Amino acid sequence: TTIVGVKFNNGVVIAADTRSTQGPIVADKNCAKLHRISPKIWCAGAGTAADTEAVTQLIGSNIELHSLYTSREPRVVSALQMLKQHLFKYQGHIGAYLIVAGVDPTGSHLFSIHAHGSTDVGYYLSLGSGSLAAMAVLESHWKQDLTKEEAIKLASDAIQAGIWNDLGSGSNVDVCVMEIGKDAEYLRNYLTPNVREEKQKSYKFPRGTTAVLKESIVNICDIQEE
Template sequence: MLSGTLRLMELNTGRKARVITALRHAKQHLFNYQGYVGAYLLIGGVDPTGPHLYECSANGTTMAKPFAAQGSGSYAAISVLERDFKQNMTEDQAVDLVQRALHAGMHGDNASGNSLNLVIMRPGKTEFRGPIVPEFCKKPEPVDLTYKFKPGSTKVLKKKVYKFDVIESMDISH
């Protein structure tokens, strides 16, 4: 939705859309739905006014940030970013910081997947790197061991029996 709107605007005006324009369209759309879309966005880029990064919540609230993280592993990622972020970092320092933050987010959250992609935005050029698979994601899952105990080898410490009266039953055989 957003990319199509921005592309139409670029075709009509003959100029590339600015980051703030993308942000404004996104926040107005999300505000109209009062959070029911459920989309939380990070909108960033480099335009003639410089680099920008914005956090946009599901209800359209936005905030400019020097760094941000969202998603299920974001708490671990933010802790790395807050500890190690410095203004005026070199590109290599920033890439290293982002990778460490993503590794922290992935390591502490099984739902984060097992690879990451980096996008480096410069004036007039965007570079995609990935998929990058961290070393801890390459390790095989541990095999569950089967435990077999001989009858009577474990001691029953306490036994409690509950009796239930069947009031109604349901046939689920078909």
């Protein structure tokens, strides 16, 4: 997994690759790692995939109830505080490593969280097995006062470094841009640089190739009238 976050002029952008693995095997080639905590607070997760999804949903659910209770739009520091206290309590057993980003009435924010519950602040961050490849790119090209276009470019380039150089990362680049005073724009499959080439042969079989012992209709309908 390669995930990054990059601050810019009027907001923040996060990005991620789309490969999920079980050991050396690729389970899903187009996985969605950019999760929504709230409309304008998004996070990307590395580590145990179920934990990153579950902890995001739980805090997202409680954030929504909090927003309704307080009649205010949710803040990134609230999501951060709730995530870290949940993860700390479970002493690293919930293997969620997240980059949390968003905009709220206070402004634009970017944080990272470790599974044991420690958090960090930064203008550019990277997490996952491809984080070193991504950080190399970020450390080479990041500057202060980036534009929206420059940040998206930098973020996706950092994910690409992970895609090509880290075996734990691959396939496509997903992006989400969160700008102040605007709707968050989720760009699913922003880049697609790994389409499989056409195969040399068609492996469609002639009908009747497989040997069959018995056939029967399966009753999926309920008990019938009359």
